């Protein structure tokens, strides 16, 4: 997007993630697995929602409309009756075409942004325990089982427990 | 016999959308007639699958 997570340093998206929009994949000692992140999913959907509702509270409840099809060739008044509609309809298209195209480029860049957000929530958890591989991947430098990384997923990770280990794996 | 706020000469349409392309004549709380017949809004992220 403008943030270059989605279709950026995040090589490509995940078709095997059916319970969520953004989420986690680990490999470790015990095995390997995947979970969705529910807040950042809900985050994104909750905007795209309101956005939609906003795009739609309009439908021209006005008001004695005028004749627009014709039985005769009449000249002057008829001409203006057509110019007036032909014009309106041109504008109201432009209006529509602009609307989707803005709405859409935003709707895209916004969800890209959320994937950044999750990524910065996670780096800041792993203060000096991890490093950014560069492809939306963290190398932790400490032994971390399926209960450990569950902490990370649910935001309950303490970084000082593991610090001493991780540091020594990294710098030594 | 049915319920529908918007009537055109072609016949009743739904005003759940914002924009109709059916007929430029209306009567009722009718979407705004436009030239296009399809304008799609994103309801999701950019889709980037494998090969």
């Amino acid at each position, epitope marked *: 997007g403008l943030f270059g997570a989605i279709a950026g340093f995040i090589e490509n998206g995940w078709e095997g993630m059916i*319970d969520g929009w953004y989420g986690f994949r680990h490999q470790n000692s015990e095995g390997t697995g995947q979970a969705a992140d529910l807040k950042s999913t809900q985050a994104a959907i*909750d905007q795209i929602n309101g956005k939609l509702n906003r795009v739609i509270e309009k439908t021209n409840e006005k008001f004695h409309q005028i004749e627009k099809e014709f039985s005769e060739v009449e000249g002057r008044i008829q001409d203006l009756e057509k110019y007036v509609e032909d014009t309106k309809i041109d504008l109201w298209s432009y209006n529509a075409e602009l609307l989707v195209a803005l709405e859409n480029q935003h709707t895209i860049d916004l969800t890209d942004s959320e994937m950044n957000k999750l990524f910065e929530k996670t780096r800041r958890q792993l203060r000096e325990n991890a490093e950014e591989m560069g492809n939306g991947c963290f190398k932790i430098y400490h032994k971390c089982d399926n209960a450990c990384i569950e902490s990370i997923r649910n935001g309950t990770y303490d970084h000082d427990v593991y610090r001493d280990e991780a540091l020594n794996n990294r710098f030594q | 016999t049915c319920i529908s706020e918007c009537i055109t000469p072609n016949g009743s349409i739904p005003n*759940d959308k914002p924009f109709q392309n059916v007929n430029k004549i209306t009567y009722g709380a009718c979407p705004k007639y436009v030239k296009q017949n399809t304008l799609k809004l994103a309801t999701g992220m950019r889709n980037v699958p494998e090969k």
Partner: antibody, heavy 129, light 107 residues
Framework: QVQLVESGGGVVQPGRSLRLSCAASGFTFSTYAMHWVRQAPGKGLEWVAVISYDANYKYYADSVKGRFTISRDNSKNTLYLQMNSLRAEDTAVYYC??????????????????????WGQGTLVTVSS | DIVMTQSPDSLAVSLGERATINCKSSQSVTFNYKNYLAWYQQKPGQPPKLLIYWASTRESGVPDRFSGSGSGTDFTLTISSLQAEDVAVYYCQQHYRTPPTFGQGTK
């Protein structure tokens, strides 16, 4: 303002069926996700299921999941529920509520619903022979 | 699933005096500055009408004296003083996650 007159519920014996109904006047019905909500008398109040305004998203509470089939029509502004193979602790009255949230996009099983705004008149059901 | 208390269980107050119920959940119910939590009244044999919503807002068109508060998981109703038209069943309920999870029944 809002009305939600229901229909079509009585007794039917075990392992059987009936389709319920729910009229809706006084609000643009085809833009609001819809529910079914039940109680067994005296004991705890319980959630059945839901059906997005879309008509293309439906989710259930495990106690009836795999037996039931919820749906809706939008030219005739009404909501049903299709019941197939009724079990023991089912005996209860049913109630069609209105979701508060506007065009809630129910993209997944678990997403935040909105609070139950208004409530239908009623319908009587008892799995009994 | 997710779990809702109403502790203590049943109310036993007199006519013209304050009081308080207490609703507690398992997972937190605050997200993006909004507290997803709504109650209800059920005059036995009438389908429920709406009391509080989103934590602390009044109902569609409810009595002046009720109040509601709390954040996170530790919510608290507060009726001003028990009136004549106040003799019904009650619950608390969340809508942060499907399935929306109900309570048991406050007389």
């Amino acid at each position: 303002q809002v009305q939600l007159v229901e229909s079509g519920g009585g007794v039917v014996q075990p392992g059987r069926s009936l389709r319920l109904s729910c009229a809706a006047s006084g609000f643009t019905f085809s833009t609001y996700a819809m529910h079914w909500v039940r109680q067994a008398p005296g004991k705890g109040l319980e959630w059945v299921a839901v059906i997005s305004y879309d008509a293309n998203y439906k989710y259930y509470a495990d106690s009836v999941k795999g037996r039931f089939t919820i749906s809706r029509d939008n030219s005739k502004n009404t909501l049903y529920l299709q019941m197939n193979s009724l079990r023991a602790e089912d005996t209860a009255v049913y109630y069609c509520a209105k979701d508060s949230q506007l065009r809630s996009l129910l993209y997944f099983e678990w997403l935040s619903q909105g609070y139950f705004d208004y409530w239908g008149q009623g319908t009587l059901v008892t799995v009994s022979s | 699933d997710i779990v809702m208390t109403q502790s203590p269980d049943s109310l036993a107050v007199s006519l013209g005096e304050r009081a308080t119920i207490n609703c507690k959940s398992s997972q937190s119910v605050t997200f993006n500055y909004k507290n997803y939590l709504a109650w209800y009244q059920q005059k036995p044999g009438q389908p429920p009408k709406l009391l509080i919503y989103w934590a602390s807002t009044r109902e569609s068109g409810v009595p002046d004296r009720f109040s509601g508060s709390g954040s996170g998981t530790d919510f608290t109703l507060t009726i001003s003083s028990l009136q004549a038209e106040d003799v019904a069943v009650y619950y608390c309920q969340q809508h942060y996650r499907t399935p929306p999870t109900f309570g048991q029944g406050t007389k």
